[PDB]
Structures are given as structure tokens and as C-alpha cells.
């Protein structure tokens, strides 16, 4: 398992940290997982995904989420030169601090990127080639393909239309709501089911 | 050839499928090809490309096409829980059904993505970081870098300007036409020649 | 070091060229470096980056720069079928000719792409998922995430706002100036420090 590796000693990280990966998660041989990473149950990590917890850490990927081809997870440093926490570079979730927090039943679709500090709430679809950076995406959200959230909080239950780059909180507060007739309303549930089954199938051949 | 692999058994796929790759195609050691995939003659598949036919299948890449660095091919499931074909998730081309169909002399340039259901017609350039999803791109087309086609049919012989995200069929019908003086008019022919020669050169060292 | 490779013989390249990589640079095992490439001191090349100098060449990455996850460097051919240099496909920097020139203290952030012909000047941040193609980016510049420069020269000391695709020189000449109170004004210095330290740390475990 050359592709699952400790992070190196740095001025902000004095001991190597090794990923904690649940046995029901599947890491593709050509995915890469480095450093202080926790990956939950049934998580499918596809080829060419890179989860790199060597600058900002920790990075958490919750149960039944998926990390698809070419997705990148990385984060800005959380420890100062003085050794003090950089509060603006961490996100608090359930009373704990993370560089990147991915909740449960989250899909990170092909070539998307979540860059810390960032959190993605449960049951949220992050669409293909989408981008999340210095942002909190609520639960039950849909980032359509090529959308982006930079420096904002996306309210629970909203979607970002394809191609839209949201940098203003006033715009984020105004985003349209997911409804039963919205075209992507049931997509994440489908994608999560598929990827749980892919992880199970790939593990049976391992 | 650890990087050329069968897909796993899943509820929608009861037997493993293995890629069919012509001997004149070159698969980079750090490209990944999984599942029910057919790759034609002289196809150059560059490092970090991921062709993954494990959800929707089959994926077809025609003769003399190229799949460049970091390109992703994947597709939505084509078989229901009941085992019935999901017709909206397949494309018909020449009387056959595909999850993703890439025609002949097609360039999929660096970091682009074609996500099924989708078809790309012959002699079409899909530019760097471009995106094709639930769409039919005609033949002799040019998707400039960062362009996207989502949920539309691109008429033969049109181009999408750089950065434009086309989601409306009315907009797709109005796209500008490739002409001899268009800046990208002869690019695909050049890129196809280069990649055929790269595949030949890389195979001679293999 | 299977991932550091010569380029193949082609009609435009009659002898194989091998990368020249300084001993203080770190190449991730799942990065790929092919062909006529020069990589300077302390350069961190992250997982899934592909530096491919097999069509246009040479590709140069200067001292203390970094090439992050999923970044692609490639270039259009520089030699004609007749064997004459294609002048429009090379960039001159300090009296020398390159397919891609990356200066010193440059960050190529996750999933960005620089496609030759192109030059990036010293101390410039190329943001996540950004794109540089047939362009000269000045020194002390910031391309925010999802920005792009195609067919233009970016003056020294300017930034491109997130998501903006610059294709017109008149627009490039008008881009806003980096100032001490600009949000990204000090980012590149920070990122360069981090990546120098990452390269040192990763090499100590190698
Ligand atoms: Zn980063
Ligand atoms: Zn997919
Ligand atoms: Zn190229």
C-alpha cells in the first residue's frame, strides 16, 4: 500500500501522521492518501484522487461518502510559525476542528476539489469539476458541475447552477432552493448508492 | 498491466468486464482503464487519464482519437434496480447503445471530462478543462478550453467559445460555425497527428 | 523511478530526452515527468501532476516553484514537419527559447494547467483549477482560482479575479493591480515556503 502514506515532518508538523481508513472503504491503487486523514465506512476513492493532509490537517471524509476520479483534497496550514493555531484556517464541526470536513453521504464528483479550510454538510452533491474553498457548504445542497463556492457559507438545501462562481455572501444567501422537481434533487442519493456498491465490489476482488 | 482492470460485480453488473484495447493503442503506466471499455487503433492515453466503465457501460473510444492527461471518462448507470435499461442514460450511435461514445479522430485535451450519457462525433476537438455531460457533440466541432456542454446537442460544425457553459438547447442551436478562418479550425487535425505519432513512439519503447 | 521517463522518438524529436531534476526537488511517486524537462531546486511535485515534454519542448520549472496535485504541463509542437522551429509556439525568456517556462517562486496550485507556448514570471500564484495557454503571465501576478489567461500577456503585478477567463489583450491590460491590502497579496510567499518545506520533508523519508 505505497499509495497510503504518512505525511512528512515539517516546521508545522513535528511527527508523521498516518491515514485512518475504515476496512469497508476502497482506495484505488492509483489514488493517493497522505497524512492525517480519516476515511469512514464504505467510502469509494476512485483512480487519480489525491487526498493530501500534509499542510493543513486533519482531513475527514465521513461514512458513505465518495471521492471520485481526479478529486483533490488539500488544506492551508493550520499551525503558525509560532506554533499557534490559525483559527481562520480551521472549521469547527460538532465541537471538533478540521482543515477539511466532508460529512456523510457526500459525493465529490469527478475532478472536483475541496480545499481547506472547508466543510461540506451531509447528503450534499459536489458536482463534476466544481470547487469549494474557504467555504461551508450546508447539508442537502447541490453544487452543479463547474460551480464554485469561495469564501462563503451555502445555506442548507440550496443549489448553485452550473458554471456559477459564488464569492459573495449576499449572493450565497440568495441561492435557489432544492425542491422535489429540481433536476438534481435526487441525484446524490443515487450516486451514494452506486459508490457504496462499487466499494463493496472492488473490495471483494482485493 | 495492473492499470488495465476488470470492473467489479455490482447489483447492475453481474459479471466482470475487461477492456478491449487495440494493440496499436498506448496506455500510459499511470493511466487507468477499468471495465467494459473498447479503445481503437493508435489511441494515445496519457498519464493520469481515468477511463472507468464500472457504473454506466460500455465506453467506446474510436480509432485515432486521443485521451490526454487527467481526462476522465465515466457514466451514469444504464441498468435499473429492476434490471431494465435506463434509456435516458444511453446514447444510440449507428444502431448501437453506449454509455459514452467517442468517435474517430477526436481529441480529449488535458483535464477535460466526458460523462455519460454522451457522444462526441468524429473529428471534434474537446478543449483543455472542457466538460461534456448528458450531451451529443456533433462531428467537426470545437469545444474551446473551459467550455462545457450539459444536457444539449451541439450541431455538427459549431464551436463553443472559451469559458462558455451551454445548458440551453436554444443557445446550442445558435452556436457559431467553424469556418476556414476560425482560429481553431485546423487544430484537431494537428493534435490527432501528434497523438498518433506519440502512441507509435511510446509503443516502440514498450 | 518509473515515473521519470525519457520522451519517445517522433517525427519532430529524433532522440530521446531525459528530465534534468535537481536533487533537492521532490517528485511524488504518483507524479509523472516525461521528456525534455528541467526542474530546479526545492521544487515540490505533488501526486497526479503530469509534466509531459514530448510534443513541445523544452519545459522549464524554476527554483523554489511548486507543481501541485493534478497540475498538467504540456506544449504544442515547436518543430515543423520540415524541421523548422514554429516561432509562434515558443517563448523567449532571458535570450533562451522554451515551450513552457515557469519562473522562480511560482506556485501552480491544485488542478491548474499551463499549456505551451507559455511563460509564468517569478513570484506568481497560479490558482486552483486555473488555466494558462498561449500566454505570458508577468511576475508578481495572482491568477485567482478558476481564472484563465488565453492568448494574452498579463502585465506584471496584476491579478485575475476568480472565474474570469481573459482572452482579450485590451482586457488583460486593464486587469486590477496587486496592492498590500489585496486578499491574495501575500499568498504566494506563504505557499512557496510551505512547498519548499514539504519537498525537504518528503526527501528525508525517501
Ligand atoms: Zn493546497
Ligand atoms: Zn460518474
Ligand atoms: Zn497538449
Give B86 to chain C, closest Cα distance, Å.
33
Strand partners, B38: B20, B60
Q: Say which of C6, C36, C41, C55 is annotated catalytic.
A: C55
Distance of CA C48 to the CA centre of its chain: 15
Closest CA to C149 of C162, C167, C163, C161: C167
Mutate to test the interface with A, among B29, B30, B72 (most CBs of A within 10 A): B72
Residue A48: phi and psi, rounded to 5, are: 70, 5
What is the per-residue burial (b if ≥16 Cβ within 10 Å, else e) of A129-163? bbbbbbbbbbbbbbbbbbbbbbebebbbbbbbbbb
Phi, psi of C196 (to 5 degrees): -60, -45
For this PDB entry, the determination method is: X-ray
Q: Which residues contact C56 (CB under 8 A, 6 or more apart)?
A: C74, C75, C76, C77, C78, C89, C90, C99, C100, C116, C117
CA distance B180 to B200: 30
In terms of C-beta density within 10 A (0-12 exposed, 13-18 middle, 19 or more buried), how is residue C86 classed? middle
| Torsion angle defined by CA atoms of residues B37, B43, B47 and B51, in that order, rounded to the nearest 10 degrees | -20
3-state secondary structure of C200: helix
Per 3-state DSSP, chain A is made up of helix, strand and coil in percentages (nearest 5) of 15, 35, 50
Enumerate residues 6+ apart whose C-beta is below 8 A from A43: A22, A24, A25, A26, A61, A63, A64, A65, A66, A67, A195, A199
Distance separating alpha carbons of residues C141 and C29, to the nearest angstrom: 30
Please report, for residues A54, A102, A118, A127, A189, the alpha-carbon distance to residue A62 in angstroms, rounded to integers and kept in the order given.
19, 6, 14, 18, 15
How many C-beta atoms lie closer than 10 Å to residue C85's C-beta? 11
Is residue A142 within 8 A of residue A184, CB to CB? The reply is yes
In whole angstroms, what is the distance from residue C119 CA to residue C131 CA? Answer: 12
CA distance A142 to A121: 11
For the record, the C-alpha cell of C169 comes out as 489583450
| Cβ contact B54–A198 (<8 Å) | yes
3-class DSSP state for residue B2? Answer: coil
Kindly list the structural domains of chain B, giving each domain's residue range(s) and its CATH number in brackets, ordered by start: 4-204 (2.160.10.10)
C-alpha cell at position B137: 457533440
Find out whether A1 and A26 touch, Cβ atoms under 8 Å.
no
Cell of B54: 464500472
CA dihedral B133, B135, B139, B140 (to 10 degrees): -60
Cα C161 to Cα C175: distance, rounded to the nearest angstrom: 9
Q: How far apart are CA B109 and CA B120, in angstroms?
A: 13
Instruction: Give A100 Cα–ligand 2 centroid separation in angstroms.
Output: 23
Note if B55 is an active site residue: yes
Alpha-carbon gap, residue A135 to B9, rounded angstroms = 37
- Burial per residue of B95-128, b for 16 or more beta-carbon CB atoms within 10 angstroms, e otherwise: eeebbbbbbbbbbbbbbbbbbbbbbbbbbbbbbb
User: Distance (Å, rounded) from C-alpha B27 to C-alpha B206?
Assistant: 10
Helix (H) or strand (E) holding A192: helix A187-204
Element (H, E) at A197: helix A187-204
Interchain pair A146, B165: CB under 8 A: yes
Side-chain half-sphere exposure of B124, counting CA atoms within 13 A = 27
In angstroms, the separation between the Cα of residue B198 and the nearest Cα of chain C is 7
| Pair A185, A168: CB distance under 8 Å | no
User: How many whole angstroms from C161 Cα to the centroid of ligand 3?
Assistant: 25
Rounded Cα distance between A142 and C112, Å, is 24
Residue C69: closest CA among B126, A71, B76: A71
CA of B115 to the centre of ligand 2 (A): 6
- Residue C126 contacts residue C140 (beta carbons within 8 Å): no
Alpha helices in A11-166 (DSSP H): none
B50 contacts on A by Cβ (under 8 Å): 30, 46-48, 69-70
> What is the C-alpha to C-alpha distance for residues B203 and B23, in angstroms, rounded to an integer?
9
DSSP assignment letter at C86: -
Question: How far is Cα A90 from Cα A102, in angstroms, rounded to an integer?
Answer: 13
A84 burial (CB, 10 Å; 0-12 / 13-18 / 19+) is exposed
Identify the H or E element spanning C202: helix C187-204
Is there a cis peptide before residue A95, judged by omega within 30 degrees of 0?
no
- Which residues of chain A neighbour C146 with C-beta distances below 8 Å? 131, 148, 165
Cα-based distances in Å from B159 to A117, B104, B154, B188: 38, 18, 8, 12
What does DSSP say about strands A100-102 and C113-120: parallel, antiparallel, or unpaired?
A: unpaired
Alpha carbon B4 to its chain's center: 17
Cited resolution, angstroms = 1.9
C-alpha cell at B95: 444502431
Residue pair B199/B44 in contact by the 8 Å Cβ criterion? yes
CA dihedral C167, A115, A51, A23 (to 10 degrees): -140
What DSSP string runs through C6-49? PPPPBTTB-S----EE-TT-EE-TT-EEEESEEE-TT-EE-TT-
Cβ atoms of B49 and B175 closer than 8 Å: no
**Inter-chain residue contact C47 with A34, CB threshold 8 Å:** yes
Cell digits of residue A45: 476513492
* Residues C119, C90: Cα–Cα separation, whole Å: 9
Q: Is A194 on the interface with B (CB under 8 A)?
A: yes
If we measure between CA atoms, which residue out of B44, B46, B40 comes closest to residue B63? Answer: B40
Q: What ranges in chain B are assigned the alpha helix state H? A: 169-173, 187-204
Partners of residue C59 on adjacent β-strands: C37, C100
For residue C52, what is its C-alpha cell? Answer: 509531459
Tell me how many helices (H) and strands (E) chain B has.
2, 22
Instruction: Give the three-state DSSP class for C97.
Output: strand
Strand order in the sheet with B107-108: B26-27, B44-45, B66-67, B107-108, B125-126, B142-143, B159-160
Residues in a beta bridge with A1: none
Verify cis geometry, omega within 30 degrees of 0, for the bond prior to B117.
Answer: yes
- Shortest Cα distance, chain B CAs vs residue A49, angstroms: 10
Residue labelled with grid coordinates 507524479? C31
Amino acid at each position: 500500500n505505497s499509495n497510503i502514506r504518512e505525511n512528512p515532518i515539517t516546521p508545522w508538523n513535528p511527527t508523521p501522521k498516518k491515514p485512518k481508513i475504515h476496512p469497508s472503504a476502497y482506495i484505488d491503487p492509483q489514488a493517493s492518501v497522505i497524512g492525517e486523514v480519516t476515511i469512514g465506512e464504505n467510502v469509494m476513492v476512485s483512480p487519480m484522487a489525491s487526498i493530501r493532509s500534509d499542510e493543513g490537517m486533519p482531513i475527514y471524509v465521513g461514512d458513505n461518502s465518495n471521492v471520485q476520479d481526479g478529486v483533490v483534497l488539500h488544506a492551508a496550514r493550520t499551525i503558525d510559525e509560532n506554533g499557534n493555531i490559525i483559527e481562520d484556517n480551521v472549521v469547527e464541526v460538532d465541537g471538533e476542528k478540521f482543515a477539511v470536513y466532508i460529512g456523510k453521504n457526500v459525493s465529490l464528483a469527478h475532478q472536483s476539489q475541496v480545499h481547506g479550510p472547508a466543510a461540506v454538510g451531509d447528503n450534499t452533491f459536489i458536482g463534476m469539476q466544481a470547487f469549494v474553498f474557504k467555504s461551508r457548504v450546508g447539508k442537502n445542497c447541490v453544487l452543479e458541475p463547474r460551480s464554485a463556492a469561495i469564501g462563503v457559507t451555502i445555506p442548507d438545501g440550496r443549489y448553485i447552477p452550473a458554471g456559477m462562481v459564488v464569492t459573495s455572501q449576499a449572493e450565497a444567501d440568495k441561492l435557489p432552493k432544492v425542491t422535489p422537481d429540481y433536476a438534481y434533487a435526487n441525484l446524490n442519493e443515487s450516486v451514494v448508492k452506486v459508490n457504496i456498491a462499487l466499494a463493496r465490489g472492488y473490495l471483494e476482488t482485493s
